[PDB]
Each structure stands twice: as C-alpha cells, then as structure tokens.
Symmetry: C3
Subunit: 228 residues, 3 copies
C-alpha cells in the first residue's frame, strides 16, 4: 500500500485525537479519543492492504516524510511494518491492539434535530480565539432567530452567563429551542468547511461535523438543554 | 473605532514598556514604564473615539489580530470593550484608570545639550550584540572627536571600565565633554532611524529618541557625568 | 584575519562536535570531542594569522554574524579578540588553553581496508531516521555482494539482532568480511557527499569520512568484527 499526502495529512489530524490508531484493510479510517468524547472517520483515496495497530501515529507519519512518495509500505516478515524506499528500508513496530483504544463498527448518525454550517475562516477564528479568551466551552443556541455559538470561560462562570465570544452561523427556520454545550477541548476537526448536524433526544446529544474529507462527532455536555 | 495594522504594531511596542495602557480619544498615544524610567508617545493616523484603560494590552492586541480589519472597537454595554465584526463579536474587559500607571501629560523636550542620530542598522546591531555580550548598560560619550556608544556588563564590571562593544555615531561639533549612561533595560524603542537628543542639567539628564512615528524619553543614570 | 561565510559554516559545524576550539596560525582547523570519540579537520580558504583558544565557539560565531563580512578580527591589546568593521568594535574573550580540549596533531589515516561512498541524500536520511527510530548504533557490512548500513537500538536490543533501518551504499568489489560498528552519537559530519574509508587491524578500527569541505574520523566500537 502507499499513502498519498492527503491521507497522511488526515492521519496527522487523527493523531491529535488519539496518539495511536487501528488501521484495517480497505479505504476507511477511524479513531476516537481515549475518553470517547470525540470520534472521527474518513474514506481515503489510498487503500490499506493489511490490519495493523500503530501505537505512535505521529511518529510513524514523521518517518514516512523521510522516504520517497512512491515508498511501498507493507507488513514485515516478523509482523511489523516495512517501508521500502528506492535504496533503503525502514521497519516500524506494530503494536498489540490492546494498547490502542479504537472505536467500534460505524453506525449511521441519527436524523438531525437541527442543521447549520460553519465556514473554515470561522472555525479558525473560533479555535484561535479560545486560546486568548480562555474559552473552554461553547454553546450552540438561538438568538433573534439565528443559530449562534457563544463562548464561555467555565472555570470562572459555572452557569455560562458571561458570553466572551459570539459567532452567528445563519438563520434558523425551525421552531424548537436548545442550548447545546460543547467542550472546546473536543473540537479537533481539521481546518475546513463543515455542515453542522445537531442531534438530541432526552439526555442524549451529539454534534456531527460533516466535512469534505472527514466526519467528526463530538458529545454534548450533560448541561445541555432543549425541547426536541 | 478601527485600529490599523500600523497602530496595533505601535501599541504592541508600547506593551513592552508597560503591560497596560490608557487610551484617550484623539490621535495621540503615550505610555510610561511603571518604574518611570522610560516614556513613549506617538501620533497615530487612526482616531480613538472613547476613553478606556486596558490592563493587559498584549492580550488585547492578540484578540484584535483575530478579527477582520473592519473590526469596530467600542464601549460595551456594561462599560467594557466590544470588538464587533459583521458576524462575530468579542468582548474584552476595560479596567479602572486608577489601576493603570500612565503619564498625566506629554513630556516635552524643549532643550538639548547635544544632538546626534542613530541609524536603524546600528540600533539593531546594538540591541543584538548587547544580548550576546551580556551588555546591560551603555555610555554615550566623546572619543577623539567622535560621539560613540560604549557597552558594558555592569555585574562583571562595576566601574564601567571594560568596553565590550563600541559604536561610532559620527563626529562631535560641540565643545563639551560628557558620559551619559543608560540602562539597556530602558532601550525599548522599536526598529527604525532616530534623531538623538541628549540633555543634562546638574544631577539631571534625559535622552530622547525621536522616530518617524513614536518618540522615547529615557532618563540617564545617576553616575553620568558632563561639563554642561 | 577575515572569516568568510564558508569558514564560519564549517566552524559552526565543528562547534557541534566540541563547544570550544583552539585556532592556530595557518590555513587549517581541527577539533575533537571532549570525550575523544570523533575527530574533524579541514583546509580553509582564509588565513588565521594568530593563535587563540575560544571557549564558546557558537557564541563567537553568533557575534560574527552581527557585523559586516569585511570585519577585521584581531589580537586585542590585552590578549583577547577584537572584531571590527566600518563603525563598530566588538571584544570577545580569548580562553586559557586549559579550559578547552583540543586535538594534538593530525595522525595520518592508515591505508584502508575497504572503501565506499555515501551520497548526501543517503546521509541525511540516515541521520533523520536515526532520530525518529531511536537508532543509537549503525553497522557497516556486506550483504549480497553489497556494502550496507544497518541501524539498531542497542538499549532495546543488546545483541544487535533486530535491524530497524537498512541503507544500500553500493556493491563491494572486494572479497573480505566485516561488521564495523559505529555509535550514532559520533556521526557529526556536516551535510554533503562523502567518500567512506574504513580501516581495521586486529582490535583496532576507524572510519574516515572524506568530504569536499572537511574530513571526519570516528573510531569503531569494540564489538566490530573483520577478517582484514
């Protein structure tokens, strides 16, 4: 198998969600944070031709940048990974799968309670601002008939009453009410545009970021409220 | 009000002098070190439309560098700062004036004892060499008919007797003799060319670096000598 | 004396071998690591017109990068170093040879047992991979009529049995058997192409990397083997 630049760029991102990964034969990759707050999946143009668990994904990816593009990666004789360059060979350890937390088989996302979208420059601003504003939690709600994302510094407003940052995502044509709360540390989507699919039922809730390359599903905090 | 890239760059330089600042409506900014050793002022092209004190100038400038150019900065509903964009909004705390040391009035430099200049490439060399040679104090004096700047490491040489770096500005046309001493920690001018105005009356003295947008006034140290 | 950019670049690389150096009148420089494991030398195109020991080479070279290349480096009135250009003078300390471990004399590298080469690209990858794979020791040997370098992780594999990296240098037109072991920490040659000269007698052994700018000599580890 071979890994194009796009595929390694995706893997580098999944590497920020979970340092390790479980690759399975086919053109689909997926991962989740050790604590299950964030999950991500993607169909890739490259094809994986064997099942292997890589404990240090970013390390593996770095080692692939030292080889040619047409490098041929395969399963080493002893069970590891073999990267064959024009005149050189690199062997990378394959880990026992028990040392890598991986997600269960993919299940279709439910039908959305609410739908909207976020543009690359806005996701970028949201993420960049959280650092300087000490924003560690955001809430997607409705104000004056438009979906908006408010940012708070929970450590010192617990009730999320003092909005420090506010972003308008467009108009809401629904009729329901909600204030879905997300933990900023879970927003690991790679930069780019995203369709935002909000889902809630009772005390269950999740936000899906459907992008052009991958999909990210993040959990809503217990404190979330709605009338769906 | 809208602040341009040129104005925020100056405010960023002023933040190295004092971490907080007091803005007054108009097109003039000035600040002073909390210990009162260095002063700075600048005329700006943008206009400030409301009076406001900012405790953490740097943090503020980091937040402005995240919103568009059109970003309008205004007096918030609850008396703080509002940074409005077309689709986003960021709030920032406005401090009580009393909690921010600031100059009460501009420092005029009506008279000079000596006038010289320092070119941008030479000021840059001075600063860099200083870091490399632990130079923490400089001395402006006359040497064989030339105005020069000598650099020393005060801790390893209390008599300011071992010059580690020497820079010639030009020849002196005066008739006086002097040795103006400056603590490098007070050389906060941003890069550029400067007219240098030196003044000393008895146990008094100060140096003014006149730039083509901001000026700096730093006090000479007590062990300075002169025949003025 | 005036040091051109190519001499300072070489001097900067020797500094990674031994933080200090002993310069001597002539057109030749050399140095050896404090623990005596690696030796380096080179012919330079500038003339060093006087003996001087430099305790902090990197610092010195940094200083030299703040003045014009036309800078005159001379023996200070009091034994130290004086660097001077158009309008500025910098003084750098000369060290007592006692505080600097320098080589004694270029002992002629013996006839070689075997000879090969390593292209710049290969060398770079060897170093880059060694870091990513934590390869602390390499082995130069013959495999299928070819000279090859195998990298191991000696702390995690004492017997040097599991190759983690392998590079092909070229075919061995000779007919001897050898397994020359080198400690990665001694591979300090600056980047470029090199002629590899390997030599061994009994329990004696060393490798000389012959480059166009400079030459590096590194000893072989005790565990090396050969029938030369």
């Amino acid at each position: 198998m071979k890994l194009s630049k796009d595929t390694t760029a995706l893997l580098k991102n999944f590497a920020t969600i979970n340092s390790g990964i479980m690759l399975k034969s086919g053109q689909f990759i997926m991962t989740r944070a050790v604590n299950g707050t964030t999950y991500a999946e993607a169909n890739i143009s490259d094809v994986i031709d064997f099942d292997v668990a890589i404990y240090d994904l970013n390390g593996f990816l770095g080692i692939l940048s030292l080889v040619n593009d047409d490098a041929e990666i395969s399963q080493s004789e002893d069970g590891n990974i073999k990267i064959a360059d024009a005149r050189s060979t690199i062997f990378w350890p394959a880990a026992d799968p028990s040392t890598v937390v991986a997600p269960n088989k993919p299940i279709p996302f439910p039908v959305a309670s609410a739908v909207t979208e976020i543009k690359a420059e806005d996701l970028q601003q949201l993420l960049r601002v959280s650092r300087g504003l000490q924003i560690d939690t955001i809430a997607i709600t409705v104000k004056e008939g438009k979906i908006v994302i408010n940012g708070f510094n929970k450590v010192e407003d617990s009730a999320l009453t003092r909005v420090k940052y506010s972003l308008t995502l467009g108009d809401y044509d629904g009729e329901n009410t909600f204030n879905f709360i997300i933990n900023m540390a879970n927003m690991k989507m790679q930069p780019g545009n995203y369709k935002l699919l909000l889902w809630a039922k009772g005390k269950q809730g999740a936000a899906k970021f459907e992008g052009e390359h991958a999909n990210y599903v993040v959990a809503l905090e217990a404190d979330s409220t709605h009338d769906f």
